[PDB]
Amino acid sequence: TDPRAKWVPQDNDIQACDYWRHCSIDGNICDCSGGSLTNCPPGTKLATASWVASCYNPTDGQSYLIAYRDCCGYNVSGRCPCLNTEGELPVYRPEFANDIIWCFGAEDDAMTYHCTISPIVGKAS
Amino acid sequence: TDPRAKWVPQDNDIQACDYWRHCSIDGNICDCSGGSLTNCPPGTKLATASWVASCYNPTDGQSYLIAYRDCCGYNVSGRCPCLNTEGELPVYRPEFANDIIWCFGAEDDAMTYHCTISPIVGKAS
Amino acid sequence: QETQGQAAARAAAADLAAGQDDEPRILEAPAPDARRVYVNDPAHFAAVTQQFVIDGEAGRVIGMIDGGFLPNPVVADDGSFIAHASTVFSRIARGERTDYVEVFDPVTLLPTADIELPDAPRFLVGTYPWMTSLTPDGKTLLFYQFSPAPAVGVVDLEGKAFKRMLDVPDCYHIFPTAPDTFFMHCRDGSLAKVAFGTEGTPEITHTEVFHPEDEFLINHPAYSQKAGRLVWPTYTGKIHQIDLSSGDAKFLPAVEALTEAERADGWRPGGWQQVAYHRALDRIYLLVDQRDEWRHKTASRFVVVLDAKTGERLAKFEMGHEIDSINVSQDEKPLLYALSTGDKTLYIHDAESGEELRSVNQLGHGPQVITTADMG
Amino acid sequence: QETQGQAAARAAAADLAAGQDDEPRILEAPAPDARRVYVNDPAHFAAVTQQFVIDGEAGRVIGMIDGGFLPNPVVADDGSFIAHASTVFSRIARGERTDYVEVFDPVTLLPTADIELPDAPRFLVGTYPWMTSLTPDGKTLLFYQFSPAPAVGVVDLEGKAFKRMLDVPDCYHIFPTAPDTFFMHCRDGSLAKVAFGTEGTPEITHTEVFHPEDEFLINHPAYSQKAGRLVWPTYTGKIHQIDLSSGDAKFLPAVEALTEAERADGWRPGGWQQVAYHRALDRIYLLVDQRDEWRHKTASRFVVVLDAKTGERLAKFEMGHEIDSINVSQDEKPLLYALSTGDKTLYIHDAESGEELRSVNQLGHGPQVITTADMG
Amino acid sequence: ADDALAALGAQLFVDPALSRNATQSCATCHDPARAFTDPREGKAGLAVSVGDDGQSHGDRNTPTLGYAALVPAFHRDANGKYKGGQFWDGRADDLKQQAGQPMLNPVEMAMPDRAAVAARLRDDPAYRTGFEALFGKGVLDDPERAFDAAAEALAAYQATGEFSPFDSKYDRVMRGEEKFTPLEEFGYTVFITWNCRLCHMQRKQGVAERETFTNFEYHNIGLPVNETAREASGLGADHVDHGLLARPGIEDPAQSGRFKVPSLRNVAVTGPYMHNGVFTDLRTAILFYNKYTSRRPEAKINPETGAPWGEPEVARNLSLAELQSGLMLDDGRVDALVAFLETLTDRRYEPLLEESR
Amino acid sequence: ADDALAALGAQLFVDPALSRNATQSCATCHDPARAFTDPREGKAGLAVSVGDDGQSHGDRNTPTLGYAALVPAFHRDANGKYKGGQFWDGRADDLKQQAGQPMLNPVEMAMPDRAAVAARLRDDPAYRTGFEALFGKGVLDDPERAFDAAAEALAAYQATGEFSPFDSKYDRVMRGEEKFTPLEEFGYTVFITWNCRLCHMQRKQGVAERETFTNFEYHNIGLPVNETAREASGLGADHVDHGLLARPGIEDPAQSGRFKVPSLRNVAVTGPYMHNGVFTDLRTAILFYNKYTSRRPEAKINPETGAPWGEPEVARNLSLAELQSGLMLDDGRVDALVAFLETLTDRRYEPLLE
């Protein structure tokens, strides 16, 4: 609740903005509109592009790379909105930049923002 | 504030939902988006249709018919939303029904709801 | 007391610890069932709108559907499809208007038809469920037109095409009873029966006048198509019931949802979807509260439940929130759904005890309409 | 004392008592002036969006403009027009995508042009003012493209037609300095100068590298086209100033917006439009608060004001609200505008004293961007 | 003195000596027993009136003089529109300027000139006495003075309570002495919410002290030629009545075919309707407005003839923004409007409401 | 005995007695000094290898054996896709089934038949001793047993740590022993966010214990025919290499043109690249992928030739959903990916990069 305090990750609830994998999410958590942690909701189109962050997992002490792939082709969900920016860099370093709509590669050319999934894609370093 | 209590009109602030001419307004007050009590905001289209209501003016004790004309062709203003239903009847009495989008007759056939004006069009009875 | 977010956090952590792989993909919603419930958000007249598909039993959003300006949703009772009539413009809220019907697969939510309605014929009004309606075979969608005059549009869902507009009298709402027949409510206080063929003027028969001119029938009656029961409250909580099951209207005895003392003490129904009907229990549910007579669209904090045959009150629930709209699941041991427009929250209750079991929040900007399938 | 609602009530009551007749009509907004302010609401990535036109002197909404998905607004410094680049789809958020530019009359707010951009070329990103930009003659609009690669689209506003895409290096943002020249910011830490006043290939040249790899230049620098001054904060509140008035980039002495002691006690800039620049005073304004290093898009409660030539601190205002964006009017005794995304409110302050004078609430769902014209 | 002027006018108003063959007074065409309109049958029915010579027919319908004194003098209003004046085309600035005209019009009273009118006035000792007392000695021996004086007296007479009593049922209800019936009330509500109100109410907003159900502006609602009337007027099958554009000093072609909005007071009893008397029945005048809003085939048909309404006499400058309201009156609302408009009948004409209704 | 089986395979691996003229061993083409690939120049450069007869060339590039023991046996995975196996077209189930094939292929080691192989194994006193100890008396006297057992020994040897040491800079960075340079780290980030990750990482989500930078799936990335190699192989101007469709038991035409995703471990030192050796330089293989995404004319040109990349050998069944990512790699990202891919070089081959 202090918005300026250092963000503190938890591994006990995926729908909260302090869930560990959401350390650089910007948008809405897909689990809250019928997707899951790592799948898109019905009717939306899964992008192949992403921004990335190194997120610390307080369950196991490891740092993982999360790929923030958007679910596209629907209006923004309006559920579980979150904006975290751990490590987040400006637009000229786009791989780490999260204001961008990472919808590229989605089916049917979908480029509207619905929500974001938080899959682990590799180890940080 | 108690929404279910009898509605109490005032004659001192047209931006509030208890202003006396708003006794059967449904939507938004135009004065809050760059119109005025009886004029539409720039870029919108003034309907010729209306629903009416007899609204009691506490300042002179008279009852006036207000013709609720919509300003159309913009998305809803989002400012000063109000819903009062003094004398308001169901849809099969449409002249007194205020869920209807009263945009008919507007220029360019505009039918989207932006806000509503509250002009006196005559005396009640 | 483990929440769905906690359960998911544990399953994902287990998957990580086990080294389980899984392909990120697009989910399908679970099979439509009796406890699926749809919540439409007209968004206080915004140019775009949303529908939420909810698992009433889990209290989980399972999907959404985007819409345009004041869309009219429908749900096939057998669970085979859902649909809506919607309206968009070429530049947000300005420019060329397009009205259309979309039909969706209820598990993939993909559109399976997009059918243009020519000349922009929809009635744009705060959302009344029976202003757009499915025939009982599911093959036809009927929608209401107000301007220039009352009319009803016929859309062939199987052939995916608009057919034609039907001329009707000064009547309102659409309660289909057969593949080629529906009832409307007329200004004079009768119902009209409208039977239509592929061409020519439809057959229009009026019932007797069934209510007086100073008795006001609300915009949100409950209609069970499978029972052919129409349940129509007035502003005072008087309830009319019309049995259409024979194909012709028969009027049942009137019941009063409130006692003469409660009415004298200011109790009246109030809200949006103020009434629900459970077909198998033959029960009526009505949102009520103490209110001034012209505050009929405000929320209510109570629901009374009555036997539809006898009028006897079976329960009066303190809902514990400002409730605008109610509906029920049509299975045994039903859920009573109670939607707060102000909270943007669907509260999910045990219909027998009134007890709140769970809720679903963040349902858009001004959610108002709850729809369910009667699949039994 | 008297609010605008009260005054209007008083005027309306006098007109009625006097029997004044008046024609209900569509208003025109007052002439654009130095205290007109525009607030854009990207609505947290919603498919449709709004801009509010505000008289900063009265604190009054004087008009609105509808937009699509993540539109980019521009305002001609001379007050002669406003425009945006916007994006719509054929079924809300799905279907055929159309990108277009609209130009509006700043008093009727009617569109005077609607220019389709071929092949859906806009960069879709949370709203950065200098990702779409006017040339100082008002005849050209330049918009950024990211996919498949950094590029800049050229739109002729006079002839009302899209002209072409320009290929550029791995660079970002567009700062026009002449009718045929703009600058961009490159990954390598240089600026690129793009001279494009010909249908042939542009001439591209690079400046010196002016910042290292680990100094992060925010997404919302302030740029005064009339001064040619680009004011570019880092995440630590170090400020780069670049003078583009000669046509070539000159790098001005660096200034630190925060003291060493402040930076050891956790002070850092933060927000969205974190920085503003007043030309005639040559004054920088920076949103700062005590924060963790990676909470750089959170709101701030303080604004520091500093002399641009000397770096000397002129004030530190406690804003009294969670402020995401700032800007200033460009006239003599300027207003400091302070937009709260969370409150959906524009707080209007005296820039000299920092005191709140007035405010304008209900500015959409998540308002983020403030634009003014520099009419002097 | 005001009394005295009107009382002189009252005399002139029924005096047939102001017509060339002394057959015809103002009151012959503006018959007080018929809300100051012409009950007499001519070659075009009651569409147009016959003059003193017993065969010249006009080309326009004789309008009521009731409430004519509420109409402002011709001017341009604050919204920049022409308003007011007298005659269906506003060519007369006011009642005083109008009154002399029927006297000298060869298709009407047909006096050859002002001198001839002054001579008729002189012949009557009562006029010598009455006029001289108000205007000075020798007023009747100067043709222009006498003519102007007679016109002022008639204008004063028309401004008396007799012409504008405000004693219709509507006035009674608005005073709170009685209530509309349900149907009448429905007509009132429909009238004020539908397009009628944009033209047939004095004010754009607020309340009128003396409502006469017209804003006094000029509109082309796209009426056809009345064949039999046009025939009878002898103006020729290819004549075009240009309305307001016929006023001297109006040159703008945008004004062609526009006519002054008539007061709906006594409308139920002053059939036939419109500037050329083309429609016999009130219900039909109402239905005419449906041609601009209803989609159905029957809206194109004039129910009096069974054939299409006809092309507008003047096809340009139609008030389409007002007329094309997007809503069609059903038969219920037409019935309600008829019931409301009957309430605008002055008390003394209520027995005329039948006419078997 | 696991140890013993693999020690026997170690001897077979370098034994040229397994070739008809005794001029070549597994190690001639899979040279341990070159990450188990072929440094010999033939008619088509290093693109394809020359067999024991000194004349016959293959039509595919000799792949590394490094990390091949991590590839699962051929199967259909949980998503329904074909995965694993051996050879660029997966026609061998596993290493054991693969190992005898070069021995008998007339274009490679060219032994006439199994009996011939057995008779060479029998001529060596250490083999009679070693094989009989593991498989029983008589093993080398039955050609099918002898041949199977040699294959099993070879497969075992390839599963030893020598082939898969996990000691690249990447492995050291991931153990926290060092860091990536900034350029290498950029490259890593690009590799993981761009479409490379969809095919060149073992798992769709999560982390692999032993990452080898391939998902073992079959994809047609739309490569042209390598004309000098196709000529040298002699298969004809009308030949089509059908990839996975060549596997016996696969019949669906939709599998035509699809090849096994190679491990990118040691990619920097095992040029030339692709199943046909078509590209000499690693940068060129990277730039190939821009043909699907860049709008610039240069992206249609192979920079090694100055000419168009060429029509795909199999212009159907392309992996367009992965390949048409909508994003072009600029030169600085290409540089980054080259630097990252060099970190996948095993320690003993780091001197090959200078």
Ligand code: HEC
């Ligand atoms: C029948 C032969 C008539 C006699 C005699 C008089 N009037 Fe008349 N009146 C007549 C017509 C056909 C018209 C409309 C003509 C046109 O061009 O519009 C009129 C009109 C008036 C008006 C105008 C009313 C209005 O515009 O609403 C007035 C005030 C008027 N008439 C008064 C009047 C007087 C005072 C007369 C005796 C001098 C008189 N009329 C005679 C038909 C005939």
Ligand code: HEC
């Ligand atoms: C302005 C755009 C109008 C609207 C809307 C309506 N009316 Fe009208 N009305 C108007 C004019 C200019 C005229 C005279 C037209 C002419 O050229 O003759 C009229 C006339 C009538 C009449 C006849 C009156 C008479 O002859 O004395 C009636 C009964 C009448 N109008 C009724 C009416 C109603 C009920 C309307 C709502 C449906 C209506 N009018 C609209 C101008 C306009």
Ligand code: HEC
């Ligand atoms: C050159 C003449 C070669 C000799 C001698 C051997 N190998 Fe080979 N190898 C060669 C080629 C051209 C190929 C690819 C051929 C194809 O059709 O795809 C191979 C492949 C293998 C593989 C599969 C590796 C993978 O798919 O990633 C293995 C396991 C293999 N080679 C092992 C092997 C052994 C054990 C050998 C001696 C018995 C042997 N190779 C000799 C070229 C040549």
Ligand code: HEC
């Ligand atoms: C699946 C659609 C793939 C994507 C996306 C990328 N690569 Fe790939 N790669 C793939 C296959 C099937 C092959 C073999 C193709 C053939 O028929 O030969 C490859 C090959 C490479 C190589 C050559 C390796 C070697 O010959 O030993 C390199 C260097 C390589 N791939 C790199 C790479 C990069 C950097 C990618 C993102 C830009 C990328 N590939 C995408 C399958 C796929």
Ligand SMILES: [Ca+2]
């Ligand atoms: Ca008449």
Ligand SMILES: [Ca+2]
């Ligand atoms: Ca190779």
Ligand code: NA
């Ligand atoms: Na006629």
Ligand code: NA
């Ligand atoms: Na004229």
Ligand code: NA
């Ligand atoms: Na070659």
Ligand code: NA
């Ligand atoms: Na095969």
